[PDB]
Structures are given as structure tokens and as C-alpha cells.
Amino acid sequence: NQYDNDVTVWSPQGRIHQIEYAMEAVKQGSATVGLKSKTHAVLVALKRAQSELAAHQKKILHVDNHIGISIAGLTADARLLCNFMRQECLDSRFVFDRPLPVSRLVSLIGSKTQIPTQRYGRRPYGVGLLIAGYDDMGPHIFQTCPSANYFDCRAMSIGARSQSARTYLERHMSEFMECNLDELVKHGLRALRETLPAEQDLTTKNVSIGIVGKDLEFTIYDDDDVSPFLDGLEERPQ
Amino acid sequence: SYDRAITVFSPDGHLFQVEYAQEAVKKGSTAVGVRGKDIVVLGVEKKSVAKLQDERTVRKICALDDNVCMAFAGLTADARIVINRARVECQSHRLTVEDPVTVEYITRYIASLKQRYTQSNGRRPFGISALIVGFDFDGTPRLYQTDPSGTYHAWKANAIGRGAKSVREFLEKNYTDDAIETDDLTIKLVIKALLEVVQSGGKNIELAVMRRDQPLKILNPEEIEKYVAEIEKEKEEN
Amino acid sequence: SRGSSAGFDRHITIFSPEGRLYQVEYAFKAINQGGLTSVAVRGKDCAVIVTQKKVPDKLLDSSTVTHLFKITESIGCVMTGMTADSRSQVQRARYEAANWKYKYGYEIPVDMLCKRIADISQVYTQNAEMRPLGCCMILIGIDEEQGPQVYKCDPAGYYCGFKATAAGVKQTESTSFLEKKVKKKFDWTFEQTVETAITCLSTVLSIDFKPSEIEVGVVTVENPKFRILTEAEIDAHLVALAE
């Protein structure tokens, strides 16, 4: 291949391989699940350890009081995008005193992520994000990719073995709109569980949860703060 | 401006451009420095001057400050840049701070300069290694050496250039207090280790000595040939 | 040893062993990629532009499909080659003409506009980062001093004045046609020049076209205003050929 070293080179098929190569980086990261009810937006992510001696990686990050993200792909590209999102949310509060609507923040990512895909010597962002937010229009779940494209979704999963989680949510997507918050998180956890191999299941050390909605600001529960959600578990079946 | 990455990592994890610059120093003239008790002495060789050429110009012993001098090996044109950058820095440390430069500091600057040339756009690394000789204000003797990579270490004695592996190995066998006892025998130690690898003849040897409180001395081809006599009187006999 | 190559001389605007610029030479072939032929002729009292107006379907707004352009009240041009490339050159020509008047206070001469476009075209020929423009600009207009003018510029940066000129796919056949009409000295009136231009394009392509199938722009000593002829006025000169 010679149509795959630069983002400014189109393939004869009508494609950009360097965008698609960056899209591979997302799939290699550990799975993360986003879903919403009429009142809440919930992020559930799988922490990963390189060895048992090392701690688990951070998957869910703070953006603003009303917006939170879960990452998949390169760490530095995720941290760079997180800081841009934070800066945009800060500028919005600094100028207008009101929180930046989720739709518009994602549009800014879509515009910013597009720039490097069209300039020589630059590269696409090696991260895909699941964005959970709450504004005047209620709860939102958004999806971004290495390609500047973004989607408004009822529920989504990205990362390794996210297809299994995707199918779970697709069956129960009509369920979510009338869901209680506790029932909504269990749905998110149950989809994330499908991604794991049969030998292993969700533990208090490897599960991260982010919640934002009408009731409260974006909160991250990690270790001891996570077990309330895991306890009350319908058993892993086949 | 020229924005191309010149020095990059190889698949095996090698910096080829830096490694090629180390090939340039290995092609360089033999340079040896040794720390004594009361004095420090440098010696430089592989001179091979056409005897139609005025040799006052091609001297490889340079003074950076009142209390600091250095010897190099490799691309002599590159050395001149480094030497004069270090000479400017010697006067700036004197302007920003009252104190004269410590030997370790000037070594650290030269090393930081070379390192910067391995990670900056548009430029190739320097093709020289340096041997830095000086005294502290408290009077304790210091000898250091650098290389194209940007690393620096202190040495009791050392050699760089062609025949470095050979002369270095000699110094390991010949570096004891019996050789460092006097100021004369340390000078003799240089000449002996020098005459050990060069195309023989004290006529090709320029060496410098500096005492704890004295100004730098470049030696007469008379004075060094007097010591070449004390080696040949004690070679057929010893 | 004609046509030899070495290095990147086929890809960027650098010299071949022969001393040619292939990228410039390819830019001329891009003019033919338009699939159209342009002809311009000069009279004693006028300059005439003519080009084929091809409309693939009735879904296209026919009024918006044109290669006839106005740079100035007095100066017009016909564009041959890549459509988008041509439009960029037209916009830059208007910029240069209006810019000229702001600096110097008089209407830009047809010859001067052409040279300016040619000098800019030259830059794409010497700098490696950008391709030449695969298009061709034939300018017309009346110089207050030197009579009617017809000028043409290149992707190569070559520019010149002409008695008559063609551009595009059927260029080579139509320049030969024009040479035969030049040798014999007619009375170069408005009708003579318009018809010489129209008959030239109707023979090399062999169509005998409807008024809707061609475009005609004129410039005249009495009326130096650049005018595109529309259907009803072309139809008059077409039934005037069949007399």
C-alpha cells in the first residue's frame, strides 16, 4: 500500500486509509457503554490492567457539571480532546453564564477533529468518545470517532467486543425510556458484561460508572462507590 | 523554515542518525584526558600534518573559560560551533550569575545542546564527542566527556576517537597511584598511552596541562619531546 | 533522444534531461478534458468570441451554463478547459483589473491583463507545491489607442496577441481553417467576423447548430461594451448564414 501513509491521500476506491487505521485504535481499547432514559444519561466502562500489580486505567473523565465522557483508544489523544471540551465548556460559562448545550459541543469536536484529516503532516485523533450530558433538551448520548463524524444515539458501545453489548442494547432499547435510574445502570452493566469472556465477570476493581441527569451533576463512582450498583445482579446466563 | 524530522526511531528502537554521528567520532583523531591529584592533562593525536601546513591553526585543545578547557574528536567543523556556543555560555553564566562556570555545568550545557539536535526538526546531530577538563572553585579536579546522543559522565581517565578502545583498555591497566603520585608522571602517562596507538613520534602530539590555580598551558614541542626521551630510555631497559 | 525523463520531472515542475516541463505539458491536455472548442476572430471594427454550449439535460438551468465571462465593462473572455479552474482564473482577472484601476486610475489594457495572468501562471510553473491551471483564457476588448484586441494566455505562462485564435479539443484544425481565411483579404466587418467565427466552429465540429447550441460575445468600436448575444440575436446571424 502507498495510499495509506498520509491523510491527504485518497484511495482509488474513494477512501482515506489513515482515518480507518485510526478507527482501529478505538476497537483495541477496552469496551465502554452509554445509554439514556428520559431523565438520565449513564456511562459504564471497563477498566483494564496491563498486569495485576499495576492499577486499572481511567476510562471515564469529567468535562463539565452537565457533561461527561468515556474514552476508547489513545490516551494522549483522549486527554487532548478532553481538554478542548473542557475549555469550550469553560468559555461558554465565562461568556454566557449558562452551560453549553451538548449538541453544539459535539459539533465543535466534529469541526476540530476534521481539520487534521485534511492537512498534510497532520493525523486523525486516535480516540473515540461516548458523551453523556444533560441540558434543556433532556439527556443525551453522543458518539465521536477518529473520522470527524458524530452520532446522536439512544444507546451505544465502542471498544473491544462492543458488538455483543450493541446487540443487548438493541433488544432493550424500547425499555430504557421509562427506566428507573437503578434499572438503567444495570442495563448498562449487563451490556458491558456481554463483552467479557465467559471465564470472567464484572468486578469492583474493573468497572467504572458515570451518571448525569435531572437529579444531579456528572459523578464518577469507581471502587467502594461502585458496589451498590453491582449488588443485585441477575446471574450470567447461557 | 525547514520542518522535517531528521532523527527518528528505527523498528528495532535505534536512533540511526545519532549512531552515524558516533561513527564520525570513531573516525576522529585520538583524544585522551586524565585527572591527576594536583593537575589535569589532555592529549590529542592522529595529527598527521603535511609539514607544509601551519599547525597553530589545527589545534584540538580549546579553552572555554579561565578555568575550563576541552578536547574533541570527530567532525572538526562541528566542534567549532559547539566550542563557541560553550564560550558564549561561559560569559552568560558570568552575566546572569556572578560565579564562574562549574565544570559539570558547562558539560551539562554542551550535552543539552547535542541532545536538542537529536530531537529538533530540520537539523542533524553534531558529529563530535568532547572531553572537558577543569577545576572547581574549591579546587577538586574534574574530568567529563560527552557524545552525539547527549549523555555525559565523569571519568578518572578516558579516550575518544580512533584507537579509543585500545587506549581506554591501556588506562584501565595503568591507572594507579604509582602513576598519579607526581605531576610529571601523569603527563608521562598521557604521552605513553598516546604513543601507544599513534603512528609514532612526539612530533604529532599536542597536549595541555592545567594546575589547580595556574592558567592553561599548551606545551612546547620541546617539553614533550623531553618526556618522549624519558620513555625511550626506560623502554629498552625496563 | 526526444522525450526522456529522470527523477520526479514527470510529477513536479522541475526540468527533464531535455529541459522540458511535463507537468505544464499535461496541463494543456487538461484543457481538452473540457471536451469543448473556443474560437476568437478580430476585425477592423470588432473582436468576436464563439464557443459550443453543450447542455446534457433539461434538468440543468441553461442560463447558468457558460464559458463567456466579463472581467471589465470593456474586456471579456472565453474560457477553455477545466470549469472550476477557469472560474478561479476569471475571479483573479477581475481582481487584477479592478486592482489596476485603483492604483493607476485608468482602464486596464487587454494586453496588460493578459500579461498579469501569464505572470501568475508562471509561478505555478516554477514553484513545486502547486499544479498549473488546466485552462485557457482568450481575452477580447478595445484599446482606446490601438484598436480592437484579441489576447490568449497559457498554463505555461505564454501570452500573445492574435488576428484570430482557437482553443480546446478542435484547436489544431480550427487554427488551420483560420489561416486559409486570413490569406484571402476580406472586408472584416461585424457580420464577416461573427460568421467567420461561427462558420469555423460549424465546420470543424460539423453541426449546423441551433441558436441554443452556441455562445457569442462581441466587442465593437462604436459600442465597446462587452455583450453576450442571447438566443434571438444569434438566431439572426444563423439565418443570415443561410442566404
Binding site: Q2, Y3, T8, V9, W10, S11, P12, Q13, G14, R15, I16, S107, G110, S111, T113, Q114, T117, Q118, R119, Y120, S147, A148, N149, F151, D152, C153, R154, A155, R166, L169, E170, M173 | - | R10, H11, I12, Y22, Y26, K29, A30, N32, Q33, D57, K58, L59, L60, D61, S63, T64, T83, A84, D85, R87, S88, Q91, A128, E129, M130, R131, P132, G134
Partner: protein
């Protein structure tokens, strides 16, 4: 039809037969995208787009391919949607700059001309790649009447009575030719726009789809907006039942 190795990597390099393949390959990206449609009526302009449902997990109304570039101007896009949005942003800024400088709504032809210049600029250099999409611009006023334009990756723009871009641009155009749009009201045109999308759609290669519809005419008072759920569903039913 293509050129390997050398002449197709950069847009600053001409091919031996006078072609810029980088533009042509970017033109291929739009040909792969789902079909976007738009036809000029007697009293306005209507847009129709097939939007292929990648997953049922996405919201109804996600990946909007119909944009508001200005209050009176609507944009219909086909191709790499990421590029389509940046061009939508460029077009927005141009319509904004015009009002800031001249004090009134941008004439559609000029808006198309201006955005086309920006597109074309990305076809000349090795430093950047061409835009991988094609887009239409539609407007209506009492002064200028109904107007419809379309821009492609090369930077070319033309006026239209009927226009289509994407997968089945050919299947659409032959179906558009059938209509007497010069006499049709824009309420009628929606029905026909809806059925042509359904005919064009491949229900045996592509999995499923949603239909996007836009207004810009006298019934909207000259403002570009979305076709209501009521009027769309009447036109969707019309499309399904005259498919026999």
C-alpha cells in the same frame, strides 16, 4: 480510469492525460454515499435524502444531511459527512460575512460561487486534500424566484431544475425528467420527491433507510425549514403505494 503509483497521490501533480486523480478519487467518495435529491418547483425548492440506518441504536433525526446555511438557504449533502459539515460551516460564514458587509440576504448564486472557490482551493496543492463530498444549495424569494445550485469536489457549480447526487444519481435523474416541475407547486413536488427516493433505494443491498425532507418556498415565507411529520408521512405513504 485510474493511474497507479505516481500520478494519483498528490493534487499538485497532473496525470499524463491531463487529469487530477486526487479530485476524481474524492469524487468517488460521494458516488459511494447514499442519494441526495432536490428539484426546483414553481414556487420554491424541495430536498429529499435517503439516510441509511447503520444501527437501530441511533436516534431518528441523527446524522442530519439537510442543513440550514442561512435562514433562506438550505444545503443537501452527499459524501464524507465530516467534510460536508465543514463546508456547511464555511457556507454559513460566507452568508454571514455578506450581510455584515452589504446589509441583506446573500443571493444564492453568489453564495454558491463563493463556497465553490473555497472547495476548488483544496484541489491545487500537495499540502491539503480535496473535499470528499458534493452538496446542493436551494433558496426562494419573490425577487430572484426559486433557485437551485450544486457544487462538487472540483469546485464546479451549476444551476438546476432537478438534481441528484450519490449512489443512484442516474436512477434519480431519469425519474426527475418525467416531472413538469416548471408548473408544479412545491406541495406536490414533495410527494414526487419522496417516491423517487423510494424507487432509487436498494432494499436488497442496503439494509434500511430514513427519508429526510426540506422546504424552501412561498409556503414557508421564503425561509428554509424541515417538512412537517404530517406532510412527510403523507408523502411516505404515497411513495410506498405507487411503488406497485
Amino acid at each position: 480510469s485510474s493511474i497507479g503509483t505516481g500520478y494519483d497521490l498528490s493534487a499538485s501533480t497532473f496525470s499524463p492525460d491531463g487529469r487530477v486523480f486526487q479530485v476524481e478519487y474524492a469524487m468517488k467518495a460521494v458516488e459511494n454515499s447514499s442519494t441526495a435529491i432536490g428539484i426546483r418547483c414553481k414556487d420554491g425548492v424541495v430536498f429529499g435524502v435517503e439516510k441509511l440506518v447503520l444501527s437501530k441504536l441511533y436516534e431518528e433525526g441523527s446524522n442530519k444531511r439537510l442543513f440550514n446555511v442561512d435562514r433562506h438557504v438550505g444545503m443537501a449533502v452527499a459524501g464524507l459527512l465530516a467534510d460536508a459539515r465543514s463546508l456547511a460551516d464555511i457556507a454559513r460564514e460566507e452568508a454571514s460575512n455578506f450581510r455584515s458587509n452589504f446589509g441583506y440576504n446573500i443571493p444564492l448564486k453568489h453564495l454558491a460561487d463563493r463556497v465553490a472557490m473555497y472547495v476548488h482551493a483544496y484541489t491545487l496543492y500537495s499540502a491539503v486534500r480535496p473535499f470528499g463530498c458534493s452538496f446542493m444549495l436551494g433558496s426562494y424569494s419573490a425577487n430572484d424566484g426559486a433557485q437551485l445550485y450544486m457544487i462538487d469536489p472540483s469546485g464546479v457549480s451549476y444551476g438546476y431544475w432537478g438534481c441528484a447526487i450519490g449512489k443512484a444519481r442516474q436512477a434519480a435523474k431519469t425519474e426527475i425528467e418525467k416531472l413538469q416541475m416548471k408548473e408544479m407547486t412545491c406541495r406536490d413536488v414533495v410527494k414526487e420527491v419522496a417516491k423517487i427516493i423510494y424507487i432509487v433505494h436498494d432494499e436488497v443491498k442496503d439494509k434500511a433507510f430514513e427519508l429526510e425532507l426540506s422546504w424552501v418556498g412561498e409556503l414557508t415565507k421564503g425561509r428554509h425549514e424541515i417538512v412537517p411529520k404530517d406532510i412527510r408521512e403523507e408523502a411516505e405513504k404515497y411513495a410506498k403505494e405507487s411503488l406497485k
